[PDB]
Amino acid sequence: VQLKESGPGLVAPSQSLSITCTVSGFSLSRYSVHWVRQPPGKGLEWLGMIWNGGSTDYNSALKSRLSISKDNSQSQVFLKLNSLQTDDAAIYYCARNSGFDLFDFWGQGTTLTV
């Protein structure tokens, strides 16, 4: 069981963002996946969650920017985030839910420079 991130790494302000978390070792119709971030010099923050069937829960502050979806045949989950600023520079992770909100396995993590 593994999780693997991939992204651009560098982006201009007021642009888009697209990151793909490729999973392996389990199925996306039985487990659910989280997304978290960590800015430099800050604690970890929560972004979103997609359920077993396609349905999402979002953070209240970043509700009008991000959207999470997944592909079940080609096992991957992707994230989009638009209208990015100089505050959004962080390292993004993708993790797997085990119980209610316990983060069981973790991803490698890509960094975003703006």
């Binding site: 119709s29 069937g53 396609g54 079940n72 045949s73």
Partner: peptide
């Protein structure tokens, strides 16, 4: 064509767009 062998009836995993059903 696709996973779970069902696939516009909707957008869920188990709906016809079969392993269980008629």
């Amino acid at each position: 064509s696709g996973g779970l062998g069902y696939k516009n009836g909707g957008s869920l995993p188990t709906d016809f767009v079969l392993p269980v059903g008629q």
